[PDB]
């Protein structure tokens, strides 16, 4: 049993919710919560924008230094940093940016990160401003992911959709 409310059952591991996925990490206080990222973990928009947002800039500080030590990220890549006042943990995810070009099939190798972790609260990967196709996200992460998942959708109109065409 764990504190996530109001989920829909997709599969056996998969849940979503229309949901602020900040809001809900300020409620829930995962262990684990997934940023949207990109390679430079720079958190200008989108998820990424608004998670740092929530931390006051705080994800920011933290990211420019891990970025200064190691580099950047593989697209499909991830790192573990601190959750802030949001969640114990947070996975900064990239998934291809359909808007760089970059190859969709990166998406599933970005969502096997997932499966480091039992259970995590997160948007859907290469969505919104990364230009994928969110019914294709949902069913790579359902295709993919084996550890439980609990998806926030910002946007009612696409929940209502990826629900309605859900397989
Ligand atoms: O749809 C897009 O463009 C996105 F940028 C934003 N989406 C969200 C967004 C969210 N809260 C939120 C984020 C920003 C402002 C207000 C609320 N909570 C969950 N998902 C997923 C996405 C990141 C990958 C695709």
Same mark, same amino acid.
């Given at each position: =049993?764990? %504190?996530?409310?109001?989920?829909? &059952?997709?599969?056996?591991? /998969?849940?979503?919710? !229309?949901?602020?996925?900040? @809001? ?55 790192? =573990?940093? %601190?959750?802030?006042?949001?969640? &114990?943990?947070?996975?900064? /995810?990239?998934?291809? !940016?359909?808007?760089?070009? @970059? ?65």
């Amino acid at each position: =049993v764990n %504190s996530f409310s109001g989920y829909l &059952k997709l599969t056996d591991n /998969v849940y979503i919710k !229309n949901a602020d996925i900040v @809001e809900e990490a300020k409620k829930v206080k995962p262990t684990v919560v997934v940023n949207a990222a990109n390679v430079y973990l720079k958190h200008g928009g989108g998820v990424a924008g608004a998670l740092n947002k929530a931390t006051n800039n705080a994800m920011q500080v933290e990211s420019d230094d891990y970025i200064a030590t190691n580099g950047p990220l593989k697209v499909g890549g991830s790192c =573990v940093l %601190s959750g802030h006042n949001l969640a &114990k943990h947070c996975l900064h /995810v990239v998934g291809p !940016n359909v808007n760089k070009g @970059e190859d969709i099939q990166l998406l599933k190798s970005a969502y096997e990160n997932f499966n480091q972790h039992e259970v995590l609260l997160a948007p859907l990967l290469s969505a919104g401003i990364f230009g994928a196709d969110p019914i294709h996200s949902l069913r790579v992460c359902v295709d993919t992911v084996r550890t439980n998942v609990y998806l926030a959708v910002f946007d009612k109109n696409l929940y209502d959709k990826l629900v309605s065409s859900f397989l």
